[PDB]
Every structure is written in structure tokens, then in C-alpha cells.
Design a protein around this ligand. Structure first.
Ligand SMILES: CCOC(=O)c1c(NC(=O)C2=C(C(=O)O)CCC2)sc2c1CCCC2
Ligand SMILES: CCOC(=O)c1c(NC(=O)C2=C(C(=O)O)CCC2)sc2c1CCCC2
Ligand SMILES: [Cl-]
Length: 134
């Protein structure tokens, strides 16, 4: 498994636990309603160690860029400013966020041809599945 295999545009086809995850983050009602109803695309590109992830929907588009292995300031879709590091490890992209004494992990892996995106904060989990599109 390589980071290249994750590249391209992906469309959300299933979500479980996302509202619970947003509540654990303390996201307010407007962004939680938007997160319930959006069906974003995720666009992953990677040029060696330069990674970009763009989340695109009619309601909100966000994007970040980083160098794998390097700490950077991420503005999240809910507006937190986290210290983030992304790495490709054990056949998954792993994105670790730390802020104000809190931490959350997001993983992205290929399973049976789908992109499986998992999030956790304090044992509150979500799984979002995306299918490859053109
Ligand atoms: C603040 C109350 O919000 C709602 O009832 C509501 C919807 N329905 S759709 C949407 C919102 C809130 C703002 C984001 C989009
Ligand atoms: C963490 C806060 O996340 C959000 O506020 C958020 C999304 N987040 C995601 O889609 C996320 C993931 C994913 O499936 O790529 C993994 C990290 C969060 S998608 C979206 C919103 C809020 C606005 C509408 C669409
Ligand atoms: Cl949408």
C-alpha cells in the first residue's frame, strides 16, 4: 500500500457516527446541520511528501496542504486551529491533531477499492466511506 493509491477525487457514500464526533468536538448547531446534510467530495493529491486534501461540497469547501511528517497549523472545517501532522504509516494516511490539550486522529485507507475515513476523539468514533469518481 502506498499514498499514491489514495490520490484522486472521491465521493461520500456512507457515514456513521459523524454527528456524535461533531458533538464530542463541541461543534455548534449550524456546522452540525451542515455536516449532516453535506455529501462532500474528497480530493487527495500527493507529490512525494507534499500532501493536499480538499473537501468540496455545496455547503462548504475546505482544504489543507502539508509536508508529511511536519507539524503545521491546520484550520479545520469547524474552525479550530490545530497542530497537525500527517504521515503515511502501515498502509494508511494518519492525520493527528492536537489543540488546547485535546487530540483527535483521522485515518484514511483503501479497503476493497473504497476510501475509508475514520475519526476518533476520546473513543467517540466515526466512519465515512467514499467511492472513487472521475
Ligand atoms: C440554527 C438552526 O438551523 C437549522 O434549522 C438549519 C437547517 N435546517 S439547514 C441549516 C441550518 C442552520 C444553519 C446551517 C444550515
Ligand atoms: C471535523 C469537523 O468537520 C466538519 O465540520 C465537516 C466535515 N468534516 C469531514 O468531512 C471530515 C472527514 C472526512 O470525511 O473527510 C475527516 C475529518 C473531518 S465535512 C463538512 C463539515 C462541516 C461543514 C459541511 C461539510
Ligand atoms: Cl453537499
Amino acid at each position: 500500500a502506498t499514498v499514491q493509491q489514495l490520490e484522486g477525487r472521491w465521493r461520500l457514500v456512507d457515514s456513521k457516527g459523524f454527528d456524535e464526533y461533531m458533538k464530542e468536538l463541541g461543534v455548534g448547531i449550524a456546522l452540525r446541520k451542515m455536516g449532516a446534510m453535506a455529501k462532500p467530495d474528497c480530493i487527495i493529491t500527493c507529490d512525494g511528501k507534499n500532501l493536499t486534501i480538499k473537501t468540496e461540497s455545496t455547503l462548504k469547501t475546505t482544504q489543507f496542504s502539508c509536508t508529511l511528517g511536519e507539524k503545521f497549523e491546520e484550520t479545520t472545517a469547524d474552525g479550530r486551529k490545530t497542530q497537525t501532522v500527517c504521515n503515511f504509516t502501515d498502509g494508511a494516511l494518519v492525520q493527528h491533531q492536537e489543540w488546547d490539550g485535546k487530540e483527535s486522529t483521522i485515518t484514511r485507507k483503501l479497503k476493497d477499492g473504497k476510501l475509508v475515513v475514520e475519526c476518533v476523539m476520546n473513543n467517540v468514533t466515526c466512519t465515512r466511506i467514499y467511492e472513487k469518481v472521475e
